[PDB]
């Protein structure tokens, strides 16, 4: 039961593979059995799904028995359990769309605390862990923070969203300041 993590506003590719290398019938539906998009032999059929204008596969890979389901401009709500009915197989794959967005401007005085908010889907409990330009491995499940934003933290931060053996980077820029010298 595969699982894929994605960043809000990014493109994710839920795979789905056929046994042999042969372009055959396949179809992408979501938990509610709503058809996302399948194929009509050599043609692509897009269904009623709200992911319509953003769903899409890879014709080229169909012959290699591969029938992905690329979702672009990924939305938190796009998070779900997309089945893939192919040759009587149901490759139900999971999709989690997280979104890390700092609050106060990237520019923040020295000492003040830095608050991070992780937008996540319901029934989802990830564990984030950013890494300061120096090394602060501070942790925060859903909402992190840097108690005292030290001037040696003013730079690129490398967070991480852990959710089922997987994780997604979220590089963020932070700027510390002064009174001045």
């Amino acid at each position: 039961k595969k699982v894929v993590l994605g960043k809000k506003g990014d493109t994710v590719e839920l795979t789905c593979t056929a046994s042999q290398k042969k372009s055959i019938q396949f179809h992408w539906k979501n938990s509610n059995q709503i058809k996302i998009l399948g194929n009509q032999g050599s043609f692509l059929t897009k269904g009623p799904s709200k992911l319509n204008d953003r769903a899409d596969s890879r014709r080229s890979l169909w012959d290699q028995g591969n029938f992905p389901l690329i979702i672009k401009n990924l939305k938190i709500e796009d998070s779900d359990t997309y089945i893939c009915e192919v040759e009587d197989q149901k490759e139900e794959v999971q999709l989690l769309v997280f979104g890390l967005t700092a609050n106060s401007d990237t520019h923040l005085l020295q000492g003040q605390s830095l608050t991070l908010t992780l937008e996540s889907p319901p029934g989802s409990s990830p564990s984030v862990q950013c890494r300061s330009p120096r090394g602060k491995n501070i942790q925060g499940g859903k909402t992190l923070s840097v108690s005292q934003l030290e001037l040696q933290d003013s730079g690129t931060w490398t967070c991480t969203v852990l959710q089922n053996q997987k994780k997604v980077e979220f590089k963020i820029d932070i700027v510390v300041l002064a009174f001045q010298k």
């Binding site: 509610n32 050599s42 890979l61 012959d63």
Partner: protein
């Protein structure tokens, strides 16, 4: 008729795949693109496109009926019934030499010049429960449709209105009487599937079938219109039905291209809806020319000699 009881499965009928492969080869020596592009991957994601450039002779591709006679050591079995699901035990089976003359018409959404349903309108489906399996409709009374390279097709608003009814009625007669039946245009996808595509005079027509599939089990659409006129368009760059890949055919030339075909059937595909209130939405479908072939071989099955 043959005095025996046998199993049939048009959805897993092998003649379909034997004709399909034939119809494809009937296309590689009649309609040859100026360029044909096709995916070529090792599996390593990266996929080069294999290009092929050959002569592009303008030929007025006019389909000839095709028979299918069992050779030897082989026999064709035909099923007989006014309403055959085409997937089960047939009682009035009967061995035949060749299957009726079939005109391999490649198209989407509408099945042209096929074979009408003797009794009434029949709709087969490998599983009506599965909103992913094409529903093949079989008209018992065809609806003439005339297309022209001039840019459109005319259809009888009358006949088409009736048809949607005698189809809309056969639908609920399978998904639940106390269920509203609606018809909407393609959900999305390739031009060949979203519109009623097909080939006429070797020209790939792409007719917008919105006026044919926007029927609400309530109102009409015959205000100031006697005939339905689908705004059709001929394309040169098309997605191949024979295999994933585009193909460019040379522009039109004959002073006039014209078609007058019998809408003998459709290819619908209701949307899941996730068990929502009785409001099944059926839209045009097809694109998998085999369903076509199927709609013609649904009652056949070749078998080895005993």
């Amino acid at each position: 008729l043959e005095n025996v009881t046998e199993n049939f499965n048009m959805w897993k009928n092998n003649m379909v795949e034997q004709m399909h492969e034939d119809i494809i080869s009937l296309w590689d020596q009649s309609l040859k693109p100026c360029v044909k592009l096709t995916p070529l991957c090792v599996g390593a994601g990266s996929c080069n496109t294999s290009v092929i450039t050959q002569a592009c002779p303008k030929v007025s591709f006019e389909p000839i009926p095709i028979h299918y006679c069992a050779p030897a050591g082989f026999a064709i079995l035909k099923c007989n019934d006014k309403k055959f699901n085409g997937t089960g035990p047939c009682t009035n089976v009967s061995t035949v030499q060749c299957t009726h003359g079939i005109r391999p018409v490649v198209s989407t959404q509408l099945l042209l010049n096929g074979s009408l349903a003797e009794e009434e309108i029949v709709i087969r489906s490998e599983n009506f429960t599965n909103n992913a399996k094409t529903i093949i409709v079989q008209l018992n009374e065809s609806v003439v449709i005339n297309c022209t390279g001039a840019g459109h097709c005319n259809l009888s608003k009358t006949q088409w209105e009736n048809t949607l009814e005698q189809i809309a009625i056969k639908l609920k007669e399978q998904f639940g009487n106390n269920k509203t039946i609606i018809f909407n245009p393609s959900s999305g996808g390739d031009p060949e599937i979203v519109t009623h595509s097909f080939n006429c005079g070797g020209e790939f027509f792409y007719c917008n079938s919105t006026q044919l599939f926007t029927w609400n089990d309530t109102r009409k659409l015959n205000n100031t219109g006697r005939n339905i006129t689908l705004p059709c368009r001929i394309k040169q760059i098309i997605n191949m039905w024979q295999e994933v890949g585009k193909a460019m055919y040379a522009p039109p030339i004959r002073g006039q291209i014209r078609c007058s075909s019998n809408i003998t059937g459709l290819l619908l595909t209701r949307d899941g809806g996730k068990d929502t209130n009785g409001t099944e939405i059926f839209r045009p479908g097809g694109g998998d020319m085999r369903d076509n072939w199927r709609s013609e071989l649904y009652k056949y099955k070749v078998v080895k000699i005993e």
